[PDB]
Amino acid sequence: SKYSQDVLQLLYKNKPNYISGQSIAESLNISRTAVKKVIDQLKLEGCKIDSVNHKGHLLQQLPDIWYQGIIDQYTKSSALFDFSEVYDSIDSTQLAAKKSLVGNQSSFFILSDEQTKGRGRFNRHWSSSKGQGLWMSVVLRPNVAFSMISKFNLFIALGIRDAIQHFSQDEVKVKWPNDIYIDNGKVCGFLTEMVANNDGIEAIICGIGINLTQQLENFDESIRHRATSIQLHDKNKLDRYQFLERLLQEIEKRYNQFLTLPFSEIREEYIAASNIWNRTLLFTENDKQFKGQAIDLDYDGYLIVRDEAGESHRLISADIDFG
Ligand SMILES: Nc1ncnc2c1ncn2CCCCNS(=O)(=O)NC(=O)NCCCC[C@@H]1SC[C@@H]2NC(=O)N[C@@H]21
């Protein structure tokens, strides 16, 4: 309905108190009977709303669906983000973000319950199941040189890891430079892109995909053994709204660190949170592949690699597989 988001927002704003049907009706200038119809539909979509005679309605729990009216509250109180766009389905939040950033200096994020053309690094297919993951693109406006893209990627990794770690009883680790793992399971892939020229960055677009509630059966058999979800490591129901709130918190925290701190001030923290050490790694580099060991991460965020032949490498980025 036309007023479903408006009603949902009123319910959300008024927690933990009940709000009467009459008061919603007056707030939105619609009838009591249209308020009731909207609320029945919200409950049908899986909103847990307690309704009590003479008292009104209390929103108790939201379903695994993104609602614009709720997310609007997140951006209203955000010092970072001007707005969000929320979709049930699109080709890709990253395509959408890249179109929406043109011609303005707004900071914003784009969420979709489902992506039909999710793409990771090297245009690889990213599986984006409806109602099972956070598929999001974040657009930010750092006033910095284009070479700073690499350090942004390192800072944001730690924020995403921290947000996920709050909900996982199991160790969450970063694989440099672009993924998050729980044990052998990839729980998140992110990538950082930019629009830029020699005078500076016009926008950062960080595309973030986080598996929230997949069971193992919900991953294609080709990736099942290398994929996992937060829910598979959380004894409690993962609430996607609680999680998003924590994720935006950490993104903002790490973005402000990115603007103010050298990478050397988080380099040790990064190293202790990574899962690339003390193991043979497989590198892909255009048409050639080689094996090696990660020796160090230097003050600039470059990986120091000693390959199979004993030769050292210093890498701004790499395409790394475990085995
Ligand atoms: N759901 C899943 N979970 C675990 N594994 C899966 C999987 N789907 C496929 N695979 C195996 C294949 C991985 C190959 N990619 S990677 O090179 O290893 N790293 C990587 O791509 N990072 C960046 C990912 C960017 C996704 C976000 S989403 C929102 C935004 N909009 C969009 O379009 N992109 C971005």
Side-chain angles (χ1 to χ4, degrees), residues 1-31 33-234 236-323:
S1 160
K2 179 172 187 163
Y3 299 90
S4 304
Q5 295 310 307
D6 297 334
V7 171
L8 239 202
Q9 184 181 279
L10 281 169
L11 295 175
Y12 186 84
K13 286 179 77 70
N14 276 277
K15 297 154 66 198
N17 305 294
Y18 288 71
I19 184 70
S20 66
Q22 189 70 32
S23 176
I24 299 169
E26 298 188 350
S27 174
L28 305 177
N29 196 12
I30 64 181
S31 59
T33 88
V35 169
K36 183 169 113 52
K37 288 158 69 81
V38 159
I39 294 198
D40 295 331
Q41 171 66 23
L42 296 173
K43 292 172 177 172
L44 188 54
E45 298 172 9
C47 294
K48 265 66 163 64
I49 298 167
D50 190 52
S51 301
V52 175
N53 296 332
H54 301 271
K55 201 171 168 190
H57 308 277
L58 176 62
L59 170 67
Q60 301 167 303
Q61 192 188 63
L62 288 174
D64 272 319
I65 300 166
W66 294 125
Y67 288 116
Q68 183 71 64
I70 303 291
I71 304 309
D72 285 352
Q73 297 305 286
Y74 295 7
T75 58
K76 280 186 169 88
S77 63
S78 175
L80 185 55
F81 295 108
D82 301 312
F83 61 86
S84 62
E85 300 162 31
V86 168
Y87 298 95
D88 66 329
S89 194
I90 49 177
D91 51 10
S92 166
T93 65
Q94 195 81 353
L95 297 177
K98 284 166 173 173
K99 286 175 290 184
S100 294
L101 69 82
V102 176
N104 63 73
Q105 272 298 313
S106 304
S107 299
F108 62 89
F109 62 85
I110 302 206
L111 271 173
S112 191
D113 290 305
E114 164 184 83
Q115 305 185 116
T116 61
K117 204 179 181 171
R119 288 307 184 262
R121 296 173 65 198
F122 309 96
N123 204 36
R124 292 193 278 246
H125 168 252
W126 181 262
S127 181
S128 299
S129 299
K130 179 183 164 183
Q132 294 196 327
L134 179 141
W135 325 126
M136 177 172 71
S137 294
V138 176
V139 167
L140 292 173
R141 311 291 189 157
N143 183 22
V144 300
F146 64 75
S147 71
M148 288 296 94
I149 185 177
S150 304
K151 269 134 194 207
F152 176 100
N153 203 48
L154 302 174
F155 280 84
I156 208 72
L158 296 198
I160 299 170
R161 190 221 72 89
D162 284 351
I164 293 167
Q165 184 65 86
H166 180 62
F167 299 90
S168 167
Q169 288 85 67
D170 294 327
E171 265 182 356
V172 189
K173 301 280 189 165
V174 171
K175 179 224 267 185
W176 182 95
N178 285 102
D179 305 303
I180 317 278
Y181 280 71
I182 308 186
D183 299 330
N184 287 124
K186 187 202 232 77
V187 64
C188 165
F190 61 94
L191 78 183
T192 300
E193 310 191 288
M194 61 183 168
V195 187
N197 60 45
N198 262 309
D199 307 317
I201 297 200
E202 170 187 323
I204 290 289
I205 315 94
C206 189
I208 300 167
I210 304 185
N211 303 145
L212 299 179
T213 54
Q214 290 94 337
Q215 291 286 311
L216 276 193
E217 351 152 353
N218 302 135
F219 295 112
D220 192 290
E221 60 183 26
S222 55
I223 72 173
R224 258 205 268 285
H225 58 293
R226 292 183 172 258
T228 195
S229 75
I230 301 184
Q231 187 60 87
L232 290 164
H233 302 274
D234 191 359
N236 300 314
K237 179 176 186 301
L238 182 89
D239 177 284
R240 62 166 46 196
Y241 285 92
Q242 289 189 16
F243 174 78
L244 173 70
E245 259 188 70
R246 181 110 205 169
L247 176 66
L248 297 170
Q249 245 196 255
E250 303 300 354
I251 285 173
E252 180 156 7
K253 165 179 192 278
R254 295 297 179 165
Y255 179 67
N256 280 324
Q257 283 184 7
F258 163 78
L259 295 178
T260 58
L261 305 177
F263 173 72
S264 56
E265 278 203 28
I266 68 151
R267 161 177 175 278
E268 300 272 40
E269 184 190 8
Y270 194 106
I271 289 173
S274 207
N275 61 354
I276 62 172
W277 315 115
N278 293 294
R279 66 198 305 179
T280 307
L281 298 167
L282 180 63
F283 298 84
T284 311
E285 194 179 285
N286 293 332
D287 57 326
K288 63 168 294 179
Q289 287 178 311
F290 61 90
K291 304 174 191 176
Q293 289 235 359
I295 303 306
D296 198 18
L297 196 64
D298 71 12
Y299 297 73
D300 269 330
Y302 289 69
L303 193 64
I304 307 308
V305 175
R306 179 183 190 277
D307 67 23
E308 236 179 332
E311 300 295 321
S312 74
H313 310 239
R314 175 174 187 265
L315 302 167
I316 191 62
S317 183
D319 190 15
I320 298 172
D321 285 316
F322 290 138

